[PDB]
Amino acid sequence: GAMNSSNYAELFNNDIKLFVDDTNVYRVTVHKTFEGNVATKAINGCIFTLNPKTGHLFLKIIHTSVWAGQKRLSQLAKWKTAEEVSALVRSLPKEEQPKQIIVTRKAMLDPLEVHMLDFPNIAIRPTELRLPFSAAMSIDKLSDVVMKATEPQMVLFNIYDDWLDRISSYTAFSRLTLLLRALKTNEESAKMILLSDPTITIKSYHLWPSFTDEQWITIESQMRDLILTEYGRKYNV
Amino acid sequence: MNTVPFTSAPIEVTIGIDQYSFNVKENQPFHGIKDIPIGHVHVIHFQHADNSSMRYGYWFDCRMGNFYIQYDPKDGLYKMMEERDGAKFENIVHNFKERQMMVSYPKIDEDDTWYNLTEFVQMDKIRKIVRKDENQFSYVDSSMTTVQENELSDPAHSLNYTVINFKSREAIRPGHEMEDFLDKSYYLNTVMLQGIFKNSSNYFGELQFAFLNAMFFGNYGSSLQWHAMIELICSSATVPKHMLDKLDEILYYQIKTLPEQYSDILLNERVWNICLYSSFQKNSLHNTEKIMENKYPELL
Numbered sequence: 004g005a006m007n008s009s010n011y012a013e014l015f016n017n018d019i020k021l022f023v024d025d026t027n028v029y030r031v032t033v034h035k036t037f038e039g040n041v042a043t044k045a046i047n048g049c050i051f052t053l054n055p056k057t058g059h060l061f062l063k064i065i066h067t068s069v070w071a072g073q074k075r076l077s078q079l080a081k082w083k084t085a086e087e088v089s090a091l092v093r094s095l096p097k098e099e100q101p102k103q104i105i106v107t108r109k110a111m112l113d114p115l116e117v118h119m120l121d122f123p124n125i126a127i128r129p130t131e132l133r134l135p136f137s138a139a140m141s142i143d144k145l146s147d148v149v150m151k152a153t154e155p156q157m158v159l160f161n162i163y164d165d166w167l168d169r170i171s172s173y174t175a176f177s178r179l180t181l182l183l184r185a186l187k188t189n190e191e192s193a194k195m196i197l198l199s200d201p202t203i204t205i206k207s208y209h210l211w212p213s214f215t216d217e218q219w220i221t222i223e224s225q226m227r228d229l230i231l232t233e234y235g236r237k238y239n240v
Numbered sequence: 241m242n243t244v245p246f247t248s249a250p251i252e253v254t255i256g257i258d259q260y261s262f263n264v265k266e267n268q269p270f271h272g273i274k275d276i277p278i279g280h281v282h283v284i285h286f287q288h289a290d291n292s293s294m295r296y297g298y299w300f301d302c303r304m305g306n307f308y309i310q311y312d313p314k315d316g317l318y319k320m321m322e323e324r325d326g327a328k329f330e331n332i333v334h335n336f337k338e339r340q341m342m343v344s345y346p347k348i349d350e351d352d353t354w355y356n357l358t359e360f361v362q363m364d365k366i367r368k369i370v371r372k373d374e375n376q377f378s379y380v381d382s383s384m385t386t387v388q389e390n391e392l393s394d395p396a397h398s399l400n401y402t403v404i405n406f407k408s409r410e411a412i413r414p415g416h417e418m419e420d421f422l423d424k425s426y427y428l429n430t431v432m433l434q435g436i437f438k439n440s441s442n443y444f445g446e447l448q449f450a451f452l453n454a455m456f457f458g459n460y461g462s463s464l465q466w467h468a469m470i471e472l473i474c475s476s477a478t479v480p481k482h483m484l485d486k487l488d489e490i491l492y493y494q495i496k497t498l499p500e501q502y503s504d505i506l507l508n509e510r511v512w513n514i515c516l517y518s519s520f521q522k523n524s525l526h527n528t529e530k531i532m533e534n535k536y537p538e539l540l
């Protein structure tokens with residue numbers, strides 16, 4: 004059924020699964036028109052489809068042209084997300100197709116279920132976890148490829164860089180969600196923490212800096228402080 | 241006017257005939273029901289006094305044969321049977337009519353309720369849903385499950401209603417996923433009305449047959465079927481004008497006839513609120529919306 008704290012280790016077993024986050028699919032700026040009314044301008048978005056065991060991120064870029072002349076865009080965005088995830092599954096060899104797809108927002112359940120009727124054996128699941136995948140566009144290299152796209156495009160990333168050479172996928176996912184939770188709670192501070200030290204660089208083929216194991220413990224500690232720090236500034240505690 | 245004689249009444253039972261009902265005491269000299277209107281299907285139904293578990297009954301059409309009821313002390317129920325000897329039956333009915341041991345189907349002349357509840361319900365069409373071909377009448381009870389219920393166990397004793405499933409390849413054209421899920425017109429008009437049923441007359445009859453089994457027997461799978469057939473129409477943006485107008489009439493008489501105290505169980509809040517207030521047809525069911533709002537405003 005629904006994925007939660009109780010069944011959290013299932014993410015890192017050997018049954019292929021994907022998380023699908025649709026938060027960043029339909030993105031707009033709201034602005035005033037010359038007549039003093041309000042209008043939206045779409046900007047490029049992305050589906051965030053992640054294998055939590057391997058770190059493989061299938062980033063489908065949603066170009067603003069897909070919205071042209073369409074109505075009810077927030078509703079369409081869920082169905083476009085489901086269409087694109089279904090197309091991705093069909094593009095994968097059978098032995099790479101997921102056995103479960105976990106959607107981060109429950110409004111994705113029926114759109115994805117309907118698009119996946121041809122795959123009755125792929126379980127479509129919600130989650131009670133509040134995952135911070137919306138903050139994916141705060142990763143500079145992902146934001147850059149989305150905003151630069153001039154057409155629909157799929158870009159493949161490993162969101163864990165090379166971490167799995169040294170840590171398990173449970174620990175890698177925990178680091179990722181901590182980093183993303185931090186970027187979501189205070190982006191400027193989070194990026195200051197990540198980049199405050201000029202000597203630690205991001206490899207061309209990576210998303211995050213090349214921290215040593217000891218520097219990661221420091222970094223992780225600073226991110227937890229920030230999340231508590233902001234939790235106080237927000238609640239006056 | 242036709243007659244369903246009863247050989248006897250050995251156990252105390254509440255007997256229903258269509259929307260009417262009466263109590264028969266153990267070994268009371270009851271020998272059946274006379275003056276049954278010709279031209280309609282009818283249902284004769286039973287609830288034993290000593291065990292209200294299992295309401296059961298028989299759908300029949302007196303034009304199709306001479307039917308009588310006799311209690312079976314082995315199987316413990318009132319059974320319908322067909323008398324083939326027309327002279328034994330005509331003599332039996334006359335003798336009992338002369339001794340005034342029959343109740344009269346008590347139809348008020350002004351009253352079109354039964355017609356309005358059974359306008360599209362035929363026995364041969366009813367026989368597609370309840371399969372037992374050696375009999376001209378059809379047995380139904382509270383516990384019988386539907387074919388769709390069995391998919392999600394004894395197939396001979398199932399209600400073979402038309403399987404409707406909104407998240408099914410039958411309901412959803414490849415490449416029209418969002419369109420077909422949000423507007424069910426192709427499923428209603430092409431798949432169901434043109435391909436499975438042939439005409440709306442047939443669609444309404446199953447909807448009516450599903451309601452009546454839900455109401456008279458408390459058959460849960462029938463209730464599911466009734467609501468699914470309503471929801472399929474209401475969730476279609478393109479429905480013929482005559483179907484909507486007839487649907488409104490059908491539902492009006494169903495809601496009118498429903499016992500007030502069974503509304504909590506026989507009416508699905510989500511379906512009705514969706515159909516009356518959110519769906520494409522939310523403004524097309526004036527009579528039904530008015531009786532629902534004045535009779536069951538809680539449900540909404």
Ligand SMILES: N=C(CC(=O)NCc1ccccc1)NO
Pocket residue numbers: 360361362365366367368369401402436437441442443444445446449
């Ligand atoms: N489509 C069917 C079922 C059917 O013939 N339903 C119509 C109907 C009408 C009145 C009473 C009961 C059933 N079989 O293929």
